[PDB]
Paper text:
This first key step of infection is catalyzed by the virus-encoded trimeric spike (S) protein, which is also a major surface antigen and thus an important target for development of diagnostics, vaccines, and therapeutics. The RBD can adopt two distinct conformations: “up” for a receptor-accessible state and “down” for a receptor-inaccessible state. In this study, we have characterized the full-length S proteins from the B.1.1.7 and B.1.351 variants and determined their structures by cryo–electron microscopy (cryo-EM), providing a structural basis for understanding the molecular mechanisms of the enhanced infectivity of B.1.1.7 and the immune evasion of B.1.351.
We superposed the structures of the B.1.1.7 trimer onto the G614 trimer in the closed conformation, aligning them by the S2 structure. The widened gap in the variant loosens the grip on the 630 loop, accounting for the absence of ordered features in this part of the B.1.1.7 map. Second, S982A (Ser982→Ala) eliminates a hydrogen bond between the central helices of S2 and the carbonyl group of Gly545 in CTD1. In the B.1.1.7 virus, mutations A570D and S982A lead to an outward shift of the CTD1, thereby relaxing the FPPR and 630 loop, which help retain the RBD in its “down” position in the parental strain. The mutations increase the frequency with which the S trimer samples the RBD-up conformation, allowing B.1.1.7 to better present the receptor binding motif (RBM) to ACE2 on the host cells.
Author numbering:
A (entry chain C): 923 to 1162
B (entry chain B): 729 to 827, 854 to 1067
C (entry chain A): 1116 to 1162
D (entry chain C): 689 to 728
The structure:
Amino acid sequence: IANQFNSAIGKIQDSLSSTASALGKLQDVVNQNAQALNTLVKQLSSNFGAISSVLNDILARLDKVEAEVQIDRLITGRLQSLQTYVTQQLIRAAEIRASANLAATKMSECVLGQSKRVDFCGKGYHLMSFPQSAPHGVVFLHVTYVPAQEKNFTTAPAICHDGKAHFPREGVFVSNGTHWFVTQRNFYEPQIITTHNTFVSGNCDVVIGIVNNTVYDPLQPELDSFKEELDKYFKNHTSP
Amino acid sequence: VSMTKTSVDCTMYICGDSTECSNLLLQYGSFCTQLNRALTGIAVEQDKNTQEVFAQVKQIYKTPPIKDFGGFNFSQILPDPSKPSKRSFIEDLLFNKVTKFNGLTVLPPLLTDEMIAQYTSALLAGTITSGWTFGAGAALQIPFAMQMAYRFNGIGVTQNVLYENQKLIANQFNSAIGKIQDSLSSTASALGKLQDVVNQNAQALNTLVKQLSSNFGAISSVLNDILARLDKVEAEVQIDRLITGRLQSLQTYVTQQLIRAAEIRASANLAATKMSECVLGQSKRVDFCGKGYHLMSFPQSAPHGVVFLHVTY
Amino acid sequence: TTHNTFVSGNCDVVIGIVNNTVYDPLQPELDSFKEELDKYFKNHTSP
Amino acid sequence: SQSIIAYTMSLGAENSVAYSNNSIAIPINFTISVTTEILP
Ligand SMILES: *[C@@H]1O[C@H](CO)[C@@H](O[C@@H]2O[C@H](CO)[C@@H](O[C@H]3O[C@H](CO)[C@@H](O)[C@H](O)[C@@H]3O)[C@H](O)[C@H]2NC(C)=O)[C@H](O)[C@H]1NC(C)=O
Ligand SMILES: *[C@@H]1O[C@H](CO)[C@@H](O[C@@H]2O[C@H](CO)[C@@H](O[C@H]3O[C@H](CO)[C@@H](O)[C@H](O)[C@@H]3O)[C@H](O)[C@H]2NC(C)=O)[C@H](O)[C@H]1NC(C)=O
Ligand SMILES: *[C@@H]1O[C@H](CO)[C@@H](O[C@@H]2O[C@H](CO)[C@@H](O[C@H]3O[C@H](CO)[C@@H](O)[C@H](O)[C@@H]3O)[C@H](O)[C@H]2NC(C)=O)[C@H](O)[C@H]1NC(C)=O
Ligand SMILES: *[C@@H]1O[C@H](CO[C@@H]2O[C@@H](C)[C@@H](O)[C@@H](O)[C@@H]2O)[C@@H](O[C@@H]2O[C@H](CO)[C@@H](O)[C@H](O)[C@H]2NC(C)=O)[C@H](O)[C@H]1NC(C)=O
Ligand SMILES: *[C@@H]1O[C@H](CO)[C@@H](O[C@@H]2O[C@H](CO)[C@@H](O)[C@H](O)[C@H]2NC(C)=O)[C@H](O)[C@H]1NC(C)=O
Ligand SMILES: *[C@@H]1O[C@H](CO)[C@@H](O[C@@H]2O[C@H](CO)[C@@H](O)[C@H](O)[C@H]2NC(C)=O)[C@H](O)[C@H]1NC(C)=O
Ligand SMILES: *[C@@H]1O[C@H](CO)[C@@H](O)[C@H](O)[C@H]1NC(C)=O
Ligand SMILES: *[C@@H]1O[C@H](CO)[C@@H](O)[C@H](O)[C@H]1NC(C)=O
Ligand SMILES: *[C@@H]1O[C@H](CO)[C@@H](O)[C@H](O)[C@H]1NC(C)=O
């Protein structure tokens, strides 16, 4: 488990070193804010139907009462260029907020806890996560258990024993085609079907697909091991 | 989950075929591009939204040819192969129930409704044959009554309660999927939240086109009429009015569409979160998958949306 | 105890395992019965 | 020998599941995966 984990942290370095594309969602935000400011500055060069976009060129060339009409064009277009920028940036800020609220939720539920929420902390079942800072962002290294080498088995919902029907306490009944075992749902660890691994409910008539097999009881040998000792006692006590 | 990808040739909207008008629109600089960029950003985000919801499997599971799901009858929510479009009986009710010169165009989604139905088929066949396990890793088959028993055990009800009632639980489930057909056949109103998105986008485009007929204090709203009736140095003052009102009519549309795209995004993130936590898992989050304790959910495709059939104890 | 715990495998593999007893509640419930059983055999030396 | 192709996209590899009324798959082994998720 530690070697698989250490190996996987090794692949994170290789991935984050090798491609440029890995931080694509963070670079895209730096690019949007750069492009919106490039646009906001470019609109200083636009005429808006004045005789020039250079404000001092207007005021050098024209006397006050005429220049007011040219300058008013530039004011009108520039002010619309800011209202466009601020609207775009407010709408963007709401998207970055929604991402920050998600990142804060993942800090709380993935780093400060363990999550039962499927696919909320990457593919697999969540074990833990480690935060790492990025420029304008966060990276979470999610650590997850993934079931790797499946094998098929025959299975049944219950074991029929003494007409009482038995169900698993935890896990599932499985068979290799000769013997029946109880095992945990996400890792093949077979065990003898004991009265401690199972629980009884009702009789065997009702359950669809129930199977006949033995259920063991550890009291059975731990009391027959006193039967033969007790019988030896009685047989020896015929000797006096 | 998404809305209609709309692109506008701004230059055709503001100055439809008039080269002199287009020479005037260049006096406003980048605004003719900035709005195509914004509309392209919305349009790409619809394919993003649709993949975050439906593409939660990189592998396409199929249902077995035999239907021994322990008595549970998925025939109304699994595909019908006999149709040209491989859609489930319930998905055809959903598809039925949601109903030039100006420079506007509608781009197709990257995924046709046939591919959304194929992803939804895979999510559902994964759920029916393998429970939550295809969410975690490779799909592990399990008999559907043993999956339901694990479900029951998740809501804190002991698994003997499934097996001792399995015909009743299947009859209640079959009856309840029965009522889903009856609801989705009978009323028009059940699909209201998808029809409302289709209506708002149609209403915003109706508004955007109607503003082309507005005068903005020019002597006419017809651009070619202004250029026919006036010589260039006078016409430029009338055209600057039409350019100014039209450009403001587009910035109003694109602002409304960005704000509305942020709401469809929020819904697509919720829908993707429900695909993850309701279809690919069992949720202990109360009321997140309808009223009751969550057993499992089945996704269904709808026009520009998703339907989840949540199953609850 | 054997009720508060579960067994799997053997003591060679677990890094940092410790030696202590685990109690069995059946052990007094059977050996209180063994000293009783011994008394019943010893009383049967009196006839 | 290179060119730009155009094609209908595959949604994934197809993979029919080996279902039966009495068959289960269980993992004999696991892999600890570590994956980066990046957020603005
Ligand atoms: C299903 O699982 C069963 C339990 O693991 C397994 O039964 C066991 O099989 C091994 C041999 O493969 C037996 O080992 C014995 O083999 C001979 C017996 O003559 C001796 O030389 C050995 O010392 C050893 O005792 C186990 O005893 C046997 N267990 C039982 C209770 O019978 C099955 O073989 C498995 N079947 C399949 C198809 O996988
Ligand atoms: C699981 O094990 C059960 C016990 O071996 C077995 O049940 C037995 O089934 C037979 C066949 O019906 C019964 O035999 C009786 O059949 C009729 C009455 O039903 C009589 O006319 C016959 O003379 C005969 O007595 C057994 O009585 C019955 N035993 C019990 C305790 O129910 C199941 O059939 C086994 N199932 C499988 C799949 O292995
Ligand atoms: C925990 O308790 C264990 C049982 O007392 C103990 O294991 C014992 O370790 C010793 C030392 O090696 C063994 O003694 C034998 O060592 C070799 C043969 O293995 C011989 O050269 C010696 O002469 C001697 O026979 C015991 O046999 C061994 N017992 C068992 C059952 O393994 C652990 O060492 C204890 N650990 C701690 C930390 O307390
Ligand atoms: C577990 O078993 C399934 C299918 O059951 C087997 O079917 C026969 C082929 C034979 O082996 C029987 O004794 C079994 O009952 C396996 O599914 C097959 O997988 C291969 C690819 O690996 C595929 O080509 C076949 O078409 C599949 N057959 C069916 C009926 O689905 C599955 O691979 C087995 N799992 C493992 C890990 O061995
Ligand atoms: C699963 O449910 C469907 C829908 O109720 C069943 O199909 C109907 O069966 C009756 C009786 O043969 C027909 O009259 C209907 O016209 C069928 N409807 C459809 C849409 O096919 C189907 O039989 C059930 N499956 C099983 C295995 O019981
Ligand atoms: C579980 O999978 C791991 C690999 O992740 C297996 O470990 C390898 O085992 C072989 C021998 O079978 C060794 O040569 C390799 O060096 C091991 N690799 C590592 C990373 O340890 C392991 O054997 C598998 N376990 C079972 C029971 O199948
Ligand atoms: C499984 O299906 C077969 C038919 O394919 C049937 O004969 C058998 O009785 C079923 N078994 C169970 C346990 O339901
Ligand atoms: C039988 O009992 C006597 C004393 O009662 C004892 O010495 C002897 O070892 C016993 N033998 C057996 C085989 O129990
Ligand atoms: C704990 O660490 C010490 C050294 O700091 C070492 O001697 C000891 O064996 C370790 N114990 C366990 C259980 O790993």
